[PDB]
Structure 1
Amino acid sequence: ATIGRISTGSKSLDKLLGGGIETQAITEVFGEFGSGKTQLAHTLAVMVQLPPEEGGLNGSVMWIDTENTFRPERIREIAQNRGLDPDEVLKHIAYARAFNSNHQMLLVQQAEDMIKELLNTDRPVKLLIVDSLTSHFRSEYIGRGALAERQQKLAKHLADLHRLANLYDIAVFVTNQVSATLRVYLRKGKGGKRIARLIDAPHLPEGEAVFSITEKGIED
């Protein structure tokens, strides 16, 4: 399948990314609290449900939440301000809380079942979010005695995600805090704007994009 792209809502950020976030890829977005990474997550969960002409892939979403940062009311707001139906948009976001790192890995392994079910329907899964990729791993595996196992499990987790992305033509989007992944770093700009910087992309030049957070989620 040809690589599909989902608009982030921001034309500036889309340009930096070569058009939007890619299917068959993991996009990994870093940022401190208030950087805009979870807002970008929420915006993508809406955008992907649009037709390609509007920057989406006519897709469903699966959302794995590790620290209780998913906000249904924010989905509704973004959906409505983009002229969409907030109830329909929310219905097509499948939600799962991950309680710990083992559970998080289990959820990704078993996510394949639902992806298979939706694969040849009108709303195949096109976005899988893990927000956030590392909070549980960082919490559970403390100090140098734990590092080896931590990296092992995380590596396996990322491999499971890459496989789902590649096999089923899904854009995987994960958040983190400071290949395999396309790494984007968010920071505060001036006047409440945010800045994204792309780093170490094999086939996209490094660069920066300034964007805003609005009732539409993110946009220029």
Structure 2
Amino acid sequence: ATIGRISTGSKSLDKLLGGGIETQAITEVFGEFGSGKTQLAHTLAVMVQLPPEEGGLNGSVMWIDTENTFRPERIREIAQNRGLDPDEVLKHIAYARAFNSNHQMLLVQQAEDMIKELLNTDRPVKLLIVDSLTSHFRSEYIGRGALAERQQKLAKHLADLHRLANLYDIAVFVTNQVILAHSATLRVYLRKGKGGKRIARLIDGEAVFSITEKGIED
């Protein structure tokens, strides 16, 4: 399958990414608390539902939330301000709270059932969000010996996510609050800038965007 691209809502960030976030890939955004990772996730969950000529993939969304940070009314606001029906956009997001890292891992395996269900509908899953990828792993695997154990479990979790992305032509988008190794396909460092702006840099130019009533935009 040919890769698809999802606009982030920001022309600047889209250019940095080579056209938007890619299916058949895991894109990790990382940065400090308040850098805008979850706002970008909310915006992508709307943008993917647009038709392709508007930067979407006519796609549905699966969202795994580890911090109780998903806000349905933020989805509805972004959708309405981009000309989409807020309730239809919200309905196309399958939402699950992960209680711990082991539940988070099961939820990714569980997501395959709905992905298969929707694969040949007119709105297949095209975006899978894990927000936060790492928070439960950081809280649970701590102290001497935890580095190797945590990295091995995360590697398995990321392998599961890579398989879904690659097998079903899905963009996986994950957040990480920040020498450790990482296996996302692309890592984007996000930080606050002047004038309320957020600045994005690819890790291993910079894009600048604002958080607005449309989610994010230049």
Tell me, in whole angstroms, the C-alpha distance in 1 between the residues paired with 2:148 and 2:109. Answer: 22
Tell me whether 1:198 sits opposite 2:202 in the alignment: yes
* Equivalent residue, structure 2, for 1:187: 191
Please list the CA deviations of residues 168-194 of structure 1 after superposition, one character each: whole Å capped at 9, or x if unmatched: 000000000225420001011111011
Tell me, in whole angstroms, the C-alpha distance in 1 between the residues paired with 2:137 and 2:32. Answer: 17
Give 3-state SS (helix, strand or coil) of 2:2's partner.
Answer: coil
Q: CA deviation at 1:31?
A: 1.6
Q: CA deviation at 1:147?
A: 2.2
Q: Name whichever of 46-55 and 178-187 sits farther off.
A: 178-187
Q: What does residue range 10-49 of structure 1 map to in structure 2 within 5 Å?
A: 10-49=10-49
The number of equivalent residue pairs is 214
TM-score by length of 2: 0.97
Please list the CA deviations of residues 5-52 of structure 1 after superposition, one character each: whole Å capped at 9, or x if unmatched: 000000000000000000000000002121111000000000000000
Tell me, in whole angstroms, the C-alpha distance in 1 between the residues paired with 2:217 and 2:34. Answer: 16
Q: CA RMSD in A?
A: 0.8
Give 3-state SS (helix, strand or coil) of 1:191's partner.
Answer: helix
Tell me, in whole angstroms, the C-alpha distance in 1 between the residues paired with 2:137 and 2:14. Answer: 30
Q: CA deviation at 1:110?
A: 1.2
Tell me, in whole angstroms, the C-alpha distance in 2 between the residues paired with 1:161 and 1:24. Answer: 10
Give 3-state SS (helix, strand or coil) of 2:3's partner.
Answer: coil
Give 3-state SS (helix, strand or coil) of 2:194's partner.
Answer: coil
* Equivalent residue, structure 2, for 1:218: 216
Tell me, in whole angstroms, the C-alpha distance in 1 between the residues paired with 2:84 and 2:58. Answer: 13
Q: CA deviation at 1:74?
A: 0.3
Runs of 5+ consecutive residues of structure 1 not aligned to the other structure: 201-206
Tell me, in whole angstroms, the C-alpha distance in 2 between the residues paired with 1:122 and 1:37. Answer: 29
Q: CA deviation at 1:215?
A: 0.1
Tell me, in whole angstroms, the C-alpha distance in 2 between the residues paired with 1:37 and 1:181. Answer: 17
Give 3-state SS (helix, strand or coil) of 1:8's partner.
Answer: coil
Runs of 5+ consecutive residues of structure 2 not aligned to the other structure: none
Q: Name whichever of 171-180 and 43-52 sits farther off.
A: 171-180
Please list the CA deviations of residues 146-173 of structure 1 after superposition, one character each: whole Å capped at 9, or x if unmatched: 2222111100000000000000000000
Q: CA deviation at 1:114?
A: 0.4
